Amino acid sequence: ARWFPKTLPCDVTLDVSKNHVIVDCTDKHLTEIPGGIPTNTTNLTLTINHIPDISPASFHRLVHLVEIDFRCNCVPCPRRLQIKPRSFSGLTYLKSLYLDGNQLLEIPQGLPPSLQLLSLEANNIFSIRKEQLTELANIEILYLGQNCYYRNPCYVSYSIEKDAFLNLTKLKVLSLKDNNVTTVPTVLPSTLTELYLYNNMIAEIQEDDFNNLNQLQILDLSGNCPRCYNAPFPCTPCKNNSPLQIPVNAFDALTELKVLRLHSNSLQHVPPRWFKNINNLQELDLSQNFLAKEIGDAKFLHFLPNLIQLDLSFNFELQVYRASMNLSQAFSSLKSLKILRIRGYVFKELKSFQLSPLHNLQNLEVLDLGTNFIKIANLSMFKQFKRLKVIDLSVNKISPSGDSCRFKNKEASFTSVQESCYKYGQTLDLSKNSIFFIKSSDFQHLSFLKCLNLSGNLISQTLNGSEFQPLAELRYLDFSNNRLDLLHSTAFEELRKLEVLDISSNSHYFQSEGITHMLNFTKNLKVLQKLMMNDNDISSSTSRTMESESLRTLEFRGNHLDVLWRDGDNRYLQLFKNLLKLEELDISKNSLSFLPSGVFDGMPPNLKNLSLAKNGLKSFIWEKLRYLKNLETLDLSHNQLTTVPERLSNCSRSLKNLILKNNQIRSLTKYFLQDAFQLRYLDLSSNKIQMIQKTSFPENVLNNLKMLLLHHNRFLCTCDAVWFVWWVQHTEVTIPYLATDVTCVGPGAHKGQSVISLDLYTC
Amino acid sequence: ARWFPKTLPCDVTLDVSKNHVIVDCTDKHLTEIPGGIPTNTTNLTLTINHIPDISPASFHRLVHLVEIDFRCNCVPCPRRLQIKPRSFSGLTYLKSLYLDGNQLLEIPQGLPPSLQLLSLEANNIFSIRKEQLTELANIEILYLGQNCYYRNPCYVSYSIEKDAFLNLTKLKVLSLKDNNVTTVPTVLPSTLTELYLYNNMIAEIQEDDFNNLNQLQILDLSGNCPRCYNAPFPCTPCKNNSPLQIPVNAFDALTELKVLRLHSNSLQHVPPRWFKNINNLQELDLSQNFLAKEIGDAKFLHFLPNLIQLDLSFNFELQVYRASMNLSQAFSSLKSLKILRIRGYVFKELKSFQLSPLHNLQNLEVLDLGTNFIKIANLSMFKQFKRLKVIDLSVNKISPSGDSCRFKNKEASFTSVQESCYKYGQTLDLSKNSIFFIKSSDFQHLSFLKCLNLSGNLISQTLNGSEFQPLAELRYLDFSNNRLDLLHSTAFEELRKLEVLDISSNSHYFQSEGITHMLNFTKNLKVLQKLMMNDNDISSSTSRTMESESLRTLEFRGNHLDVLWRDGDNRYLQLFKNLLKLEELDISKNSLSFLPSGVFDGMPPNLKNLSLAKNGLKSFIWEKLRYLKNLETLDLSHNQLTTVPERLSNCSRSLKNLILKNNQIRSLTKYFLQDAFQLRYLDLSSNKIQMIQKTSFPENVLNNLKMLLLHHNRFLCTCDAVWFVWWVQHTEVTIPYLATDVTCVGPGAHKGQSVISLDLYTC
């Protein structure tokens, strides 16, 4: 509630339905908590700052607070944060509290009984006692990880007294990652659901370690006795490279377990007895181990019928280069398997019969096989994997056939990189491979491919319309980081159903001058929608115009359009005129010092998104914008403009997203925003503007403005801008960083003063 | 003769034995020829400048000139250079003349009969007539190339009248490269020795084309009907991709021919009848052709018993990936073959039996096989090639086994890149290959290897002293652009005879902090002499000191020595102290803002070459140089020093090569060079110095100075430096760019004035 604040430098978000008020003071360099904080707020953000300590009077009048965040307030900085006694007892409605990165020595006392979450990561608490945990009898989620490890050493092994967590009957999630823990803290409460003991120094597991945990769902034991070969981070292998000793009858009481992580445990064998009782396991991680021989046997896979995810990445043997992948026949028992990763299983040749166990997996979607240094791989063997969604053929050497400060979620699963080409259907990610030329015979029996990534292959070829013949249903093609010779206009002609084409980073042949550059090759593409050819350094073009009846988006950044539009050369003025359906243009970083007269007349009639960022436009004309009757998102950021148009209404009748970020403008015209009621977005940040007059900023136009930025510039706070001073502190226009970034240059003592906090009584 | 010049801005070189005087005015921006040119000069250099034309009075008093160079005086610039009539008749002793890059339309007339060389490259002369060549009856070398091609088009085919060169009885070398020539200009004089007709549009060769040439030694026919696939430069294939039609009885009259170039001719067959008469052929070029099938036959090789060089690079077929290299059995007839290049013959697997024809070549030294995309290659097959000097295993994908403005020489042969490792003996250049780990078994039967290049392989391995076991006699090892984990001090221990080690560009594992970095691994290397570990970004080291009893040179540039020598951290102060025999150090680009006191005491006793370039030394102490009793070549270029030492004699008693290039020094001490008789080299260029006093620059010290630089700085030419003005124009000290780079800041009209050309009579 309370809607209107007075001088708070933190953003306020109101949710009437949720009855939640959010205050975000992230990255504000506040030495002390600012005054005037509303009593109706629910979430308080007090992240990285210069707060010396915490006082009971800080939250004296705040009784509705339900979330306090104090993450990374002192990253190892002055002395450690000190908390006065009874500093949290007054928050009866408190439910969540974060104290990560505060260099605390012991667990704070006096916490309210209503607390449900407590985070104490990146601290110096290496001792756990029941006396300090007595007050936390109603806690549900506990985060005590990253207290003693290589980044934040403490030189003392973690000590937990007997039955420390036993009386925490409400505990559900416990994390002890990177805490130098040697022994699992028995006895954990029976209500635990997620346990995170990974990246510790645990060497053995007892048979009664998880005897009472029946509701556990997620168990993590990574980093115990890890595989330290070629590790880019400090680690200590266990002795004799011994594996993490886990008894056969260890996961017996676990019946609701769903996620089990054993990554980087130096395991050599996986007994089937482990998975005898856990019949509902969904995700299993076994990466960074020594299970190369176990993959050939994989006898334990017969006890996982409901498995969804299986990770076996980077299990290669030392000084061993396998001739082929030895997949066990027990892989056919993974009926519900969806994602499979066999990376780091480096081998020479991949054959069709080696993937036979995966032929009957109906629910399999993703097959990851990248980073395996595969030399010989017949692509026609994938004709049986039509139901697969993503097939990974990454940096391995396949060649053509011959003749705590952020992330409040804390413990979260690894989110897979959702590439832009996955949404189009079947994907064959052949990026960074050893393919140096394209044959139509190689891609035979692959008409089902809706996607094909070939970035980084460094292919030097002159396509004439026959290489991608079998790819009849291809919709997305990636050809970045290659050497494409556009000597013919018939390239990609046989890709009838292609929609998006990426030929970026092909600067090699485009840099050479005097050779033909057929830029009209998009005419044959009937259903092409997006074309990305940026960072190509295109300086000449044999074709006068580019023709396309369906292209809508075109990226032409990082090229040389100045030479194409050189003074006295009108050949390429109407280069984009024939693109009738084009709606977005991205001609940026083209070293365009100036725009010759006539280019705007040659722009497509349906242009709607024009960008000229980072170009260096010394003088950009504005009366020529009348030609563009559909322009809405003109962008001139990071340019060297110096003059605003006399009347924006006379320039464009539809511009609504004008941007002039990081420009050099010292003053605005007296009628800059006169009768411009169609404008919605305006940006003038990072400029050299001095003052704004009333006649240039009418309130009628400013009322409908969604967002306006005037931060990080050189406004002068003198008596000549009383109207501006009154308006900035009495309007509802959303101006970000109003009290943090925009300051006053002068005069004299007014250096660094906040405009919204200015009250010139003498004026 | 004449020894002493007056105001010439060109360097003068005297050779009394050769009676030659050389004047070099290269890159001087001279609008007109300066006055005071000696009459005794022999060679005149008048390269790229702003000379408008040539007048007869330019060489009026010069009668001893024997060489005039006028190369690239106007690169397509004002209008073309105009030569007045009878502008060269007065040079009776002229023998050589260069007029390249002058946009001349016709051959200049009135040349003296004593001329022997004439260069007219990069001009607009596309017509040749006997009338203009009548005056050149005594010429020997003619250069008329690059007159009409893609860089300098003329849109007209070259026209040569019948028997134009017939009467040039003294002609020996003729060049017509890039001249758009269609037909060979019959009839060439019988005294021709070198013919250069390459990069032309010749489509056919007549049987009488070379009927009279019996003394010809070098013949070039490259670029005629060229192979235009993947060409980074403009080219036009002949029609029907026809080959250059050469009759069988074409090289019949040629008996002294030694070099024949047929590179890029689209040849398909090489008849043996071509080489029937040329029994003394030494170098043969057949690259960029379609002789992939001909290599399997190679029937013509039986007629080349005296061949020395054979080039067959880049003859791969389009859309064809050969399974293996098909070398003909006729290769055994090349008894005298020394260098063989089979690059661009892309094939999958290389086997031992495929190199059988080369097993009996006693004189074979270099075997080039790079850029072939070889996948499988057993390195043990090279045990039979012990006599070979260089074996090329370049960017192909071999993996570990599984289970006119310059170049006055004009027409010169392609100089092979002499890598630094070739001088050590047998070389196995395995750079940029697909090797990702090292096994001792792979390098078996290779104990004869004196060199091994492994740069760019990106190998991630933790060597412990057993990988390079069979390489007992290895002396040079290159490991640049890799990922070396120095977790053990026993690395390279088994390389007993190693002398030079290069572990540069291994920044990956060295950038990580907290992992061990055993920098004392050089102790085991008993005979190590040079160690290059630059650009490694080394910021921490587990070993306190580096020990080596034989290391003499150490490159440690592009690292982080500031963190190692951080204030309050004296652990790594004596890092290089134990290097007893070290004589050269290259610690540069280390971001060293300042040198903490004590590092000089920890320097090796025998240090002689110290470099601190591009470091950013805000304040470098000088009294600590007394510790270094053997310093001679101290370098502080591209630094931010501001104060010179009070007395250089008191600082170092052996410094003789002090360098302060690109520094920021405004003034020198009044006793900077007092009693410093041991100094030989001094550099103060690109500084902010204002004036020099007499008491700081005694003549006794300056007499023995070999070289001194005071160019490109901010000297002020007022009346306060009369002594300096007198001394700079009356001393014999070699001061480069004395009248071209060093100018006067002021005062007033004295901007840009030459100090050596200053005469202040009013002072």
Ligand SMILES: *[C@@H]1O[C@H](CO)[C@@H](O[C@@H]2O[C@H](CO)[C@@H](O[C@@H]3O[C@H](CO[C@H]4O[C@H](CO)[C@@H](O)[C@H](O)[C@@H]4O)[C@@H](O)[C@H](O)[C@@H]3O)[C@H](O)[C@H]2NC(C)=O)[C@H](O)[C@H]1NC(C)=O
């Ligand atoms: C202001 O502070 C409030 C608390 O003081 C915040 O309310 C919290 O909001 C989160 C959601 O953002 C709730 O989390 C719930 O989690 C359960 C369990 O889901 C678990 O599993 C999923 C994966 O399937 C995982 O993503 C979750 O993180 C959990 O691990 C869900 O079923 C719920 O729908 C909900 O997501 C908290 O319970 C809730 N706390 C309280 C006390 O209600 C509020 O978000 C804060 N607002 C801002 C703007 O920061």
Ligand SMILES: *[C@@H]1O[C@H](CO)[C@@H](O[C@@H]2O[C@H](CO)[C@@H](O[C@@H]3O[C@H](CO[C@H]4O[C@H](CO)[C@@H](O)[C@H](O)[C@@H]4O)[C@@H](O)[C@H](O)[C@@H]3O)[C@H](O)[C@H]2NC(C)=O)[C@H](O)[C@H]1NC(C)=O
């Ligand atoms: C000043 O001008 C003088 C002429 O006006 C220059 O004298 C010339 O010097 C060059 C050497 O630099 C002489 O070239 C001769 O070439 C023959 C034939 O060798 C040929 O083959 C070799 C490869 O085996 C090749 O490298 C050569 O370039 C030749 O193509 C050699 O046998 C000789 O030893 C010598 O190298 C000229 O003959 C000579 N000209 C005259 C008229 O004597 C002088 O070099 C100029 N000085 C400077 C500093 O520029």
Ligand SMILES: *[C@@H]1O[C@H](CO)[C@@H](O[C@@H]2O[C@H](CO)[C@@H](O[C@@H]3O[C@H](CO)[C@@H](O)[C@H](O)[C@@H]3O)[C@H](O)[C@H]2NC(C)=O)[C@H](O)[C@H]1NC(C)=O
């Ligand atoms: C995780 O806990 C283990 C518990 O052992 C820590 O190992 C201990 O580390 C300290 C500090 O390096 C060792 O103290 C050392 O003692 C030697 C004398 O033996 C002394 O010369 C050193 O200066 C240092 O004080 C201690 O011995 C060692 N414990 C054992 C059993 O070896 C480990 O450091 C902890 N990890 C982190 C990141 O804090």
Ligand SMILES: *[C@@H]1O[C@H](CO)[C@@H](O[C@@H]2O[C@H](CO)[C@@H](O[C@@H]3O[C@H](CO)[C@@H](O)[C@H](O)[C@@H]3O)[C@H](O)[C@H]2NC(C)=O)[C@H](O)[C@H]1NC(C)=O
């Ligand atoms: C085809 O495959 C290539 C390589 O696998 C993909 O390129 C990679 O795309 C990812 C995601 O866009 C890039 O990651 C990003 O890197 C930047 C730094 O450049 C970082 O700031 C981002 O946060 C993100 O991590 C990755 O760099 C890029 N790799 C290269 C070599 O460009 C490409 O996206 C694939 N194409 C399709 C259509 O899936």
Ligand SMILES: *[C@@H]1O[C@H](CO)[C@@H](O[C@@H]2O[C@H](CO)[C@@H](O[C@@H]3O[C@H](CO)[C@@H](O)[C@H](O)[C@@H]3O)[C@H](O)[C@H]2NC(C)=O)[C@H](O)[C@H]1NC(C)=O
């Ligand atoms: C090397 O010599 C050949 C000799 O044929 C040159 O080819 C000629 O090039 C000119 C200029 O492009 C052509 O003139 C053209 O004529 C057409 C009408 O046919 C006109 O529309 C053009 O505007 C141009 O004026 C000429 O036809 C052509 N000769 C032949 C037989 O095709 C070639 O250009 C020369 N190469 C260089 C680098 O100068």
Ligand SMILES: *[C@@H]1O[C@H](CO)[C@@H](O[C@@H]2O[C@H](CO)[C@@H](O[C@@H]3O[C@H](CO)[C@@H](O)[C@H](O)[C@@H]3O)[C@H](O)[C@H]2NC(C)=O)[C@H](O)[C@H]1NC(C)=O
């Ligand atoms: C081992 O093989 C590698 C690659 O074949 C060699 O590196 C290459 O060395 C040459 C000659 O030093 C470099 O050429 C130079 O390039 C610079 C530009 O960086 C240019 O300014 C010079 O004029 C010269 O052309 C080449 O760049 C370099 N390549 C790489 C990737 O570094 C290496 O020298 C070999 N090692 C031994 C001991 O022979």
Ligand SMILES: *[C@@H]1O[C@H](CO)[C@@H](O[C@@H]2O[C@H](CO)[C@@H](O)[C@H](O)[C@H]2NC(C)=O)[C@H](O)[C@H]1NC(C)=O
């Ligand atoms: C694939 O892996 C399986 C299981 O490790 C291998 O089968 C074993 O092979 C060894 C060596 O011959 C025998 O001693 C075992 O008795 C075999 N066990 C079983 C259950 O068959 C198999 O040889 C591997 N195949 C390949 C090609 O490496």
Ligand SMILES: *[C@@H]1O[C@H](CO)[C@@H](O[C@@H]2O[C@H](CO)[C@@H](O)[C@H](O)[C@H]2NC(C)=O)[C@H](O)[C@H]1NC(C)=O
């Ligand atoms: C990859 O596999 C496919 C199919 O298994 C092979 O296609 C065969 O090609 C030959 C010659 O073109 C035909 O005679 C066969 O009938 C094809 N097989 C089928 C099932 O139709 C292809 O040759 C394989 N690739 C390589 C390099 O061997």
Ligand SMILES: *[C@@H]1O[C@H](CO)[C@@H](O[C@@H]2O[C@H](CO)[C@@H](O)[C@H](O)[C@H]2NC(C)=O)[C@H](O)[C@H]1NC(C)=O
């Ligand atoms: C596209 O390029 C391919 C590759 O060169 C052409 O295929 C060749 O065509 C020529 C002329 O008909 C034949 O002599 C070759 O035998 C063909 N090679 C192969 C491997 O088939 C193809 O004709 C070109 N297409 C167009 C329209 O230019």
Ligand SMILES: *[C@@H]1O[C@H](CO)[C@@H](O[C@@H]2O[C@H](CO)[C@@H](O)[C@H](O)[C@H]2NC(C)=O)[C@H](O)[C@H]1NC(C)=O
């Ligand atoms: C793209 O433009 C080029 C010209 O820049 C077109 O090439 C011309 O094609 C016609 C028709 O065959 C020929 O008569 C001309 O001689 C060609 N000119 C050149 C310079 O090659 C090409 O056809 C265009 N492609 C498309 C698909 O429109």
Ligand SMILES: *[C@@H]1O[C@H](CO)[C@@H](O[C@@H]2O[C@H](CO)[C@@H](O)[C@H](O)[C@H]2NC(C)=O)[C@H](O)[C@H]1NC(C)=O
């Ligand atoms: C290596 O090259 C030789 C010469 O081109 C090949 O020998 C020819 O092979 C063809 C095809 O079988 C025959 O028609 C010719 O009669 C052969 N000529 C001779 C002189 O033998 C040979 O087959 C090639 N070998 C490989 C493995 O490609």
Ligand SMILES: *[C@@H]1O[C@H](CO)[C@@H](O[C@@H]2O[C@H](CO)[C@@H](O)[C@H](O)[C@H]2NC(C)=O)[C@H](O)[C@H]1NC(C)=O
């Ligand atoms: C590369 O060639 C060498 C020699 O030709 C092979 O060395 C053989 O290795 C086997 C098993 O180690 C021995 O039984 C043979 O006696 C060796 N040959 C000789 C001549 O001694 C080596 O195996 C080859 N590499 C590969 C990958 O096959």
Ligand SMILES: *[C@@H]1O[C@H](CO)[C@@H](O[C@@H]2O[C@H](CO)[C@@H](O)[C@H](O)[C@H]2NC(C)=O)[C@H](O)[C@H]1NC(C)=O
């Ligand atoms: C250097 O590293 C190699 C590779 O690990 C070591 O060779 C292994 O040594 C262990 C211990 O003796 C054996 O169990 C393995 O069988 C060996 N592997 C191979 C491929 O031989 C070697 O011992 C190490 N040497 C030193 C001095 O540490």
Ligand SMILES: *[C@@H]1O[C@H](CO)[C@@H](O[C@@H]2O[C@H](CO)[C@@H](O)[C@H](O)[C@H]2NC(C)=O)[C@H](O)[C@H]1NC(C)=O
């Ligand atoms: C290089 O220096 C490291 C120390 O930085 C040496 O490692 C020590 O070796 C001794 C002898 O075995 C051990 O007692 C120490 O515990 C080791 N210290 C560490 C930190 O590992 C290493 O031996 C040195 N190598 C050489 C060749 O001198």
Ligand SMILES: *[C@@H]1O[C@H](CO)[C@@H](O)[C@H](O)[C@H]1NC(C)=O
């Ligand atoms: C124009 O581009 C911006 C870029 O963020 C986008 O937000 C906007 O929706 C685009 N406008 C149209 C009409 O597509």
Ligand SMILES: *[C@@H]1O[C@H](CO)[C@@H](O)[C@H](O)[C@H]1NC(C)=O
């Ligand atoms: C500017 O706008 C006014 C008012 O609509 C109009 O009268 C005038 O013609 C316009 N001028 C230009 C150059 O568009």
